[PDB]
Write a protein that binds this ligand. Structure first.
Ligand SMILES: [Ca+2]
Ligand SMILES: [Ca+2]
Lengths: 462, 462, 462, 462
């Protein structure tokens, strides 16, 4: 145990800890959720502190002997070597100061240790003076967040694409599977199961497109903004160098925003991201609902498809296969809807040159991207690739249906069709085994009218 | 044509019009939705002004010569005689001031006409000095709203109670109708359709209680608050008297709030109402979702219940009955959900001594109550009463199901019960047929065990 | 007085009215809000039906005698002659069937009248067989909606651009006005009032881009889809010709969707639009909150700006001007936020081949575009143009602020800068007095360091 | 490692682990958030299992020698010793099946270890047959949740009551502190700081009552409902006995619901609780916004209150004390709003006999109560108790205001009051000074009229 001192008094900090008194006070102030910030945000903080250390050394502001160790420590943070030292709550007042200071304290203490000094000796390496040199909370925090959000969006994009590609493969696989289209949940006209899955795949491709476009506004960062965006005393060469480093180490084509005040006080880039995720989850939710309806049964349901079994069934009641993978998809969508409201409210609560409600916004943005990335993985792997069709049941739904008289209609006339429809309604007799009974269409010409392909695509009529 | 002057200038007003230059200025500021305030709010403003005049005259503050004509004019407003004269947009800046002034002008000008004077002659009877005497925007507008909301809620309770009883009648009409319970949309164990319709009756009874209890915090009113709630220059006798008239003429047991500063700045009684209406519509939307599933078909659906046709049918596809009445119920649910978010945002936006976002708040609270009332009566009259059951088809479902085995199990044992269920599901035979052919139970034994009542109620083995 | 017959019986229809029985049945089924659909939707229905008629006549499907009067009647609808005749509630079951049949009946009955026939004589011109020929509810309704929303969006874009520019004008006008930046509502470092208004202009510039970009997906229409998306019985020449007309008459670069099943069952174009509307109103609400803060006072507030007076005064209380215009703006934002949730819920609610929740979805989308257009136009005219800066009071705030010391710091050193700021804060003396008192700097040096421009832009101190 | 086989195959389980393959299966299906269920829910699952074991033993269903060990194991779960063994994601498909089984496995394996057997020997003590005897997922899970939410609500009530009591203590402390009331952020009329704090204290009192009344519907549990609510095969004696037990071990007055189907498929008790939490946070956010506004400054803000400092300030920026405790209060409210939408959407998604979306619902409800309890504690101990007033600053807002004229008005007539207000607006002369210079009132007369208590309480015209 070690002994750090504060405007509030002494606090005993374990010798093996890299955080200090400020981080502790933060945990005292905000024991709200018990969560820790996403390791990608931790990594991103390291990137910011590395870039800034490097830039400050380059412009002569930071001593090269201490900077060298500051860089080595930050690198270790980037590699995920110190995740457990980041202990502040994601829901914290102070507009992210605690998060920023946790990163400054840990990097300063690891630097000091790397140079054979004691921890807490902030005279040698100051969390504020050296590690946070030329930065404010108001630029270090949002810039690390932009970077972390962008990296997680690239992962969600490559996971959604994989999933989208597998929906397409199912579409192709069910390309000739004839079924009964439903509107208002009432039997309509024939459709191909492959057309439904292409529908799912096409909406998902438009989701990928929307989510990808939201990265553009995140590429503008406010590094060099200082407290408010005015850049008071900031060296314009520091700004140029720090941005360039941030882009190189993050892997993103970062730009210094054209108007730093704007970039410092506005939060539309995050609401833009959340909006696209919500839209995407709306579509996923609907698809999941369909999949669950289609899997219903086995005897009093639609029983159109089979989903892979993913929980042990009742060992005394077969046939009951709960669609747990789509269900979880639905509940995530619901998280994301809720997350989006929180983001919305946090964003409109901004005042003058800072929105102080970012910590709950970022926590929610990051949670959204992360849970989506994770359900897409498990749904794809555990449900989607394995989906099978009950093609006999769906073909019988079509043959015994009334709506197929729409395909026959123009070959026999509005007269004949309505008599056949009304009789198939009262007697429940097949429409096919009725055209041949009356002799209006031969066995051979029914076969080209009631063909799966002909019935579900534009072609000759009146 | 007539000509009144304002701080913005002289305005030409139609000869017939009873509103004045401040109403016209409010229609220029806020040409927002093109909508008009609810006639029930128009009515309550009438009750507010009449009560004020009566109190003021008695306190010896309003000239009895003018006051009696103000009263007469207000009575006409209460009768819904001048609804067309309330032209201000419900979505307006000014914290309701325009709404208040719309009532003041209209009641001033009509009073003036009743005593032979010119309209626009504000020297004789003033909208501000006489019709608005002793009251502020921040007491008249909210008080009228309480009275209007409460009146509206009373109608909803009455209508929701009627709907609840009709659900309960269907529960009894369906009391012996056996069917398949579904969990996760998968077949489970038997249930009666009457148990589901009693499930619906009960949640609705719970909503009625919740909605009813939100009345209490609305009975407290802030009349005499003046600008801020401190009641500076207000007369304690005017306060007691106006409150007693407001209670007598509105029909509600209205009370003067204990702390008028609290009553002027806080808006929780409004969000308390919306919440109970949100909860109610979650249940109704779900109920409606079930009904649309239950009415699905006719051939490729569930086909458990038949809903009265309200849409004309095609002569190409009979048996296609779209469940439009549950559909519109679903859509009203979604309105109310959205309205509740708007109420939330507007309520949390209060500042110091006054919430200025009250109009959009009140507009949404009034619309939620009104549209619920309307959908409830229409759903009750054009759907709920006419619902019929497909008993024969539901009995089939039960006969061919696997869940059935849960009733059979304790008369056979874990081992044989499971092998029967497994074989029934794989071969497609009914569990009854298998019980006969393997000799495990007699046709008579199975008729006693699969008793529709015994299968769906608590009770040990034999 | 006229008697049209429906499956629900004999019904009296005013001989003035151009709507028929299917329309008043929807008035009975859905007496929900009392509202009528947007004139822009009405117009687009007219474009849809005109286009249909032309395309049906060209392919040989429609009688040219009857078709010419349908076109003529459709033009009258397009030109706004018949708005009164559309009486159905925008919140309705039937998935837009009534909205579509409202348009069908009105166009038939006017085309009959133009031909010299009787209203109701549908044996001559039928609202189903002629006016609705080759179209389903499931394509004419959404196609009309796409056109309407697109038209409205183009209007909102023009208005929003006008507002944006007006913000840039104020940016330039205030480009020399110095004041205190606030982070956490706590005094920070100086900022130009112009940088704050430029920040507003830029986020609005991003809202315009985001909203404009939502148009692309609405350009894809599904005319030709029949019930479900397959185009069962459709003629490909009808589809290419109708699509060409719709695009010419609407003024929009419409395309037939590549996959009609997808374009028929998915609703992600509408949620995409609403999202960009919500995002915009988040920034606009924030801005407006700022304006109300900046305008607070005149004695116990901030008093940084004056907004045009838009409501009458109290001669008893001058100086009091409520910022009603930013107030209505915050309120329209709370509405759009609610509108967005209603839209989310309705879009998530889709099932298989059709989302039947489209009517409440569309009502809310159209409402959000309309109310945003209206407040933007009004806010620009009645507030934004005439905003004034209180230069004197803001320079006052700056001279006695502590943050001023961030500018002086590099010219005097940390130890003396901190000394002076602590003393200035505790004693209430200006930093400027204290720099002279101890002669750490002279009047002349202070006037050059404290240059408005240099304190608010990046650059090395020396 | 040990070896448990699954319908999906072999899986290695650590020697020290008490969960099994079903739990591992769950973690592979649902790697969504990485969170673990709340300790309170864990405890409650323990209470459920112990109550069920005791009931099953009494009724002769469960072996008393196995039962005794099961009960002892469950008691250790209740005691909080096996929290780390609960590894399943709160967000999961399967309607809580894996939360339920996680508890079944853990207790079985500890019961086995206590009775000297090998773990995974489910032939001795089965998680399904023994630990889960006479229960389904569809009753154990919700029953545990009712119990857990009740316990957490009772803690929230106590905490909020404490905060409330402290808000009242501060109203008394500021009972004579005079300030300027604000409407539209415009100076209005004098108010006491204590009157504001009483308004705060009073809204919270109403929140306490709302949240408390929410407990009633939760007292009804569905224990004994089995799959669907029908109680097929359930011993009625077991039901009433397990109910008496659950009430006794949980400390709540639990009652067996009067209709088990209703209780099994409806979730209105959850949405009701959440609505009451949301309303509470609407008020709390509003209060924090005022506090933050009043803390603003120190030189260019309002600065009416000082809040205890909770972060280390900048040594060169004294006076800058960010209101971090209110800021975190806002962020939690925003969180609760979104949580409430997720809940709304989860409840709405119920189908027939089971709402499978309960996991994301319960996760959200519990987080809402939890984070509320936690901010309330921290805000009270670190902010509220220590709030102090700048009474001089506030006093001079009142001396220098125009609105102080309202107190003078009746004593000098409106005509005279308007003249004095107008000059006060032009010159800047105190209204008090003006009254002296024009001799309208004696210095001693002003002392009665402009007395803090007199100015802020009902008192008449002379
Ligand atoms: Ca197959
Ligand atoms: Ca003091």
């Amino acid at each position: 145990v070690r002994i750090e001192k504060d405007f509030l008094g002494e606090k005993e900090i374990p010798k093996d800890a890299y955080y200090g008194v400020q981080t502790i006070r933060a945990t005292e102030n905000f024991p709200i959720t018990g969560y820790r910030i996403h390791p990608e945000l931790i990594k991103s903080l390291g990137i910011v502190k590395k870039s800034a250390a490097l830039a400050n050394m380059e412009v002569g502001l930071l001593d090269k002997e201490v900077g060298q160790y500051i860089v080595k420590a930050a690198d270790e943070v980037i590699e995920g070597k110190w995740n457990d030292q980041f202990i502040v709550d994601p829901i914290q007042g102070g507009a992210g100061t605690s998060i920023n200071m946790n990163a400054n304290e840990v990097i300063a203490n690891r630097a000091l240790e790397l140079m054979g000094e004691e921890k807490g000796n902030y005279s040698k390496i100051s969390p504020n003076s050296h590690v946070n040199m030329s930065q404010s909370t108001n630029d270090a925090f949002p810039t690390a967040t932009h970077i972390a959000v962008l990296s997680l969006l690239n992962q969600l994009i490559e996971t959604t694409k994989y999933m989208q590609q597998e929906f397409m493969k199912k579409a192709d696989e069910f390309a000739g599977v004839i079924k009964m289209g439903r509107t208002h949940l009432q039997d309509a006209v024939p459709i191909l199961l492959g057309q439904e899955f292409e529908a799912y795949a096409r909406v998902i491709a438009r989701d990928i497109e929307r989510i990808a476009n939201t990265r553009n506004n995140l590429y503008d960062i406010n590094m060099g903004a200082t407290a408010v965006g005015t850049g008071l005393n900031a060296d314009p060469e520091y700004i140029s160098i720090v941005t360039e480093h941030l882009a190189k180490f993050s892997g993103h084509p970062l730009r210094s925003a054209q108007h730093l005040v704007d970039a410092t006080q506005n939060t539309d880039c995050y609401t833009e991201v959340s909006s696209a995720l919500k839209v995407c989850m709306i579509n996923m939710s609907k698809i999941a609902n369909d999949l669950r309806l289609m899997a219903s049964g086995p005897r009093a349901g639609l029983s159109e498809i089979v989903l892979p079994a993913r929980q042990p069934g009742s060992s005394i009641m077969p046939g009951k296969v709960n669609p747990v993978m789509p269900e979880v998809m639905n509940q995530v969508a619901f998280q994301v809807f809720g997350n989006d409201l929180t983001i919305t409210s946090a964003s409109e609560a901004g005042q003058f040159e800072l929105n102080v409600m970012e910590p709950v916004l970022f926590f929610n943005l990051i949670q959204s991207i992360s849970i989506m990335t994770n359900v897409f993985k498990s749904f794809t792997e555990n449900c989607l690739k394995g989906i099978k069709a009950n093609e006999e049941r769906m073909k019988e739904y079509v043959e015994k249906s009334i709506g197929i008289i729409t395909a026959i209609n123009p070959h026999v006339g509005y007269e004949t069709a309505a008599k056949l429809a009304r009789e198939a309604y009262l007697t429940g007799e097949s429409i096919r085994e009725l055209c041949i009974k009356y002799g209006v269409l031969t066995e051979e010409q029914l076969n080209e009218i009631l063909n799966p392909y002909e019935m579900i695509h534009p072609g000759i009529a009146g």
